[PDB]
From Swiss-Prot, chain B:
Originating gene: STAT6
Post-translational modification: Tyrosine phosphorylated on Tyr-435 following stimulation by IL4/interleukin-4. Tyrosine phosphorylated following stimulation by IL3/interleukin-3. Dephosphorylation on tyrosine residues by PTPN2 negatively regulates the IL4/interleukin-4 mediated signaling. Mono-ADP-ribosylated by PARP14.
Function comment: Carries out a dual function: signal transduction and activation of transcription. Involved in IL4/interleukin-4- and IL3/interleukin-3-mediated signaling.
Any GO molecular function: RNA polymerase II transcription regulatory region sequence-specific DNA binding
Reported disease: Hyper-IgE syndrome 6, autosomal dominant, with recurrent infections: An immunologic disorder characterized by severe allergic disease with onset in infancy. Common features are treatment-resistant atopic dermatitis, food allergies, asthma, eosinophilic gastrointestinal disease, and severe episodes of anaphylaxis. Half of the patients present with recurrent skin, respiratory, and viral infections. Clinical laboratory testing is notable for eosinophilia and markedly elevated serum IgE levels.
Membrane-crossing residue ranges in chain numbering: none
Region forming the signal peptide: none
GO biological process: cell surface receptor signaling pathway via JAK-STAT; cytokine-mediated signaling pathway; defense response; growth hormone receptor signaling pathway via JAK-STAT; interleukin-4-mediated signaling pathway; isotype switching to IgE isotypes; mammary gland epithelial cell proliferation; mammary gland morphogenesis
Effect caused by changing residue 191 to Q: In HIES6; likely pathogenic; gain of function in interleukin-4-mediated signaling pathway; increased DNA-binding transcription factor activity; increased STAT6 phosphorylation at baseline and after stimulation with IL4
Record-given protein name: Signal transducer and activator of transcription 6
The species this protein was found in: Homo sapiens
Domain annotation SH2: ranges: 321-430
Record PTM Phosphotyrosine, positions in chain: 435
Keywords: Acetylation, Activator, ADP-ribosylation, Cytoplasm, Disease variant, DNA-binding, Nucleus, Phosphoprotein, SH2 domain, Transcription, Transcription regulation
Assembly mode: Forms a homodimer or a heterodimer with a related family member. Interacts with NCOA1 via its C-terminal LXXLL motif.
Amino acid sequence: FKTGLRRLQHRVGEIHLLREALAMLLQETTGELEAAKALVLKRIQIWKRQQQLAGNGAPFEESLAPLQERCESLVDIYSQLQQEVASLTGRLDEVLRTLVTSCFLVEKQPPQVLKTQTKFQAGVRFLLGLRFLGAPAKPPLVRADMVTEKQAREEIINNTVPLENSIPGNCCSALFKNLLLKEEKCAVLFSASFTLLPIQLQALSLPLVVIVHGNQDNNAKATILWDNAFSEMDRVPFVVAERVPWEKMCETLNLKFMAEVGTNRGLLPEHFLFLAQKIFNDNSLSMEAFQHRSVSWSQFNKEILLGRGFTFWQWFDGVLDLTKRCLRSYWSDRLIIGFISKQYVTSLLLNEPDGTFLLRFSDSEIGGITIAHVIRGQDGSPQIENIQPFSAKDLSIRSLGDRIRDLAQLKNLYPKKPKDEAFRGRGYVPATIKMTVE
Amino acid sequence: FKTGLRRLQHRVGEIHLLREALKGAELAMLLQETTGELEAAKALVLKRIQIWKRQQQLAGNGAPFEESLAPLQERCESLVDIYSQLQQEVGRASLTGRLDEVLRTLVTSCFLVEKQPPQVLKTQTKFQAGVRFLLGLRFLGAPAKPPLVRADMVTEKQAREEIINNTVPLENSIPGNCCSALFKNLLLKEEKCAVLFSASFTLPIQLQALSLPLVVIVHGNQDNNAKATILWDNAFSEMDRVPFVVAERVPWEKMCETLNLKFMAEVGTNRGLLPEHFLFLAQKIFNDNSLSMEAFQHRSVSWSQFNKEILLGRGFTFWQWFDGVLDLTKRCLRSYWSDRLIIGFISKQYVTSLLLNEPDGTFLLRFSDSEIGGITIAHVIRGQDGSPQIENIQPFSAKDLSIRSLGDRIRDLAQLKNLYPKKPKDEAFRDGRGYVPATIKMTVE
Ligand code: NI
């Protein structure tokens, strides 16, 4: 780790010792360096993958400081190998240029669904800038330029910023505070040149989709989500799989729901089952039947669901929106099952006590939550009733919890959680407002 | 009026011919006189500027206004024109002085706040004001650089003799036909202040305009008291006055006028308050139960009766109540008011009388007396037994109406059939997908 680097340190010292001169097979030390360099570049790729998945709501508690430290350490080994000292010279100098180019990274990625005529930010950071730049020579200027997928295989304003040192900051960065721009993918190339003969630095951003406000971004959001999720580390720019495993998809979705909604309760296997039924148009109640399936892009955002007028992602993002705006605390409190069929509800609820209810998302509309519940009398015969789905607007007028209370028929949330636990003069006759079922 | 001006313009010609003798230099050249005639015209204009200011102040409470300064400007322009000829005519030192006085007072009277600053002001909130110089086209321009005008905030004491973004040029617009200073975003970072606008040009002269009075509140709302202070001052000032004196007591007739205009401007409506309303209002303020409008006609109001004395049996003042119906109506009820579906101002007691001879399901809408910003339904219910009961349903607030509108609530109630007198509710107010429909509904007890 740092242990291997420890080796590299020990060797320089020896060749230093072996320098009197009062054989040079030690410069397999250059190889030992080269190996260490490839190694870092690998870590740098790993961090980018991590950052790409964070675009989708993955946990990214990764600082770039560790990668910097290591990079600086390798340069220190290089300088020593250089000062000590044929052909190896080309070699080390090759180590250096490689490292330097790999050290220029986008650190704050820009909005990946980006609207025109809207203010945006990105930032690029150079890991080795605290070895090669600084005060004597003027800071190199980093440009921002939008590019097509075609160009990246090789309109923005406020696109130039100096790449600057912070000794307090312990970094070299250029941050664009004030950027504005005036299915189809593109990127921002960030560009700077510097001599330490002059080298040109390029960072390519994560892919973007540019939209003009309204209408807007459901499609664009699906695209970013697919690319972020299913991308290959070493891909040719903006190429993704068309089909992916459903298990990978389910994951991607759980992370998404958590991020958007704002909750740490995710989706279960039981949720994935009802999801899978919908995406695949299947009714098996076995998680086994859906565990090793493949998903395509079409199934996800292109083929409209059976008996519906929307896609699967349109539906899913519809529930995200709804949950995020109205339902977030209810979802955290585990008051909503949410993803369950009307059909399976009937099975769960038929044997239950009168007044037992559950909360699901509407299968048939976008952004809907409905009440399903069991009604049974003294004859003992159960009937299930499904109350029409509520929307975001309906939920503004009166909240879900209020509506649940308004109803005397409703007694316990499944399974047996009392509705009251679970949910939070002068001569005038009282009037009240209650939700009412016909 | 203008007649005078023609007559002046004629006499000034008369002197020109006369001066051809052909020296008078020191019918008979008692012919100024023409100069007194000028001074008088000047007094008339000063009076007109004054009248205009009163109008603008009244508009502050929702009075009609719609007046332009352009006529006043032409009137000033003409007067300068006479002064100038008269001056030219003098080529007797009284006269040059007297005439030099005429010009002085007119120019100084000429500087005005055309667009007033907001009368209730918040700190760190941004606002607009405008000043205009009526004689600027004559006296500023091409040789000079435009005078800079200052915006300062002054006290009442200071005004008898903190804002930033506050210096603006006083420039002529030839297409604009005016000389004006516009302050687009001034920022400010029982108590009355004003904005003093200050310029100096040489012709030096110092130009001063003082705004209408302002109350600054530091958030830390309310702004109820501030608004009352501002309303009374605008209403009940004298043209005469010193900053910023107001009367303590005024006529209720005058108050009623004030309220009516306010209710319209503020609410967004052209339907005002009737005498039937004013009666009920009089009862509240004066705490008197007379049902004759005559009882209240020569009555007078004080500032105290208006915003300082807590209404009897209540926790609130009269203005506090009035301003409360205002907010409730502006927010929720404006169309309903316009459509005339609200009686509004009527007592619970008077309601029993109107309704008790009416048919079943007949109703009205009133503002609640016991609350701030409330609207209630009163209605008559009569069975086959034929005995009437009046039911007053508890009042609704603004919050309540946002949830379900008042029209929706009225509709919700099968008992309510016709709005008084005899307007059908319906005119006035106007499984699947195997889910069972749900609605919000309002229920009575
Ligand atoms: Ni109208």
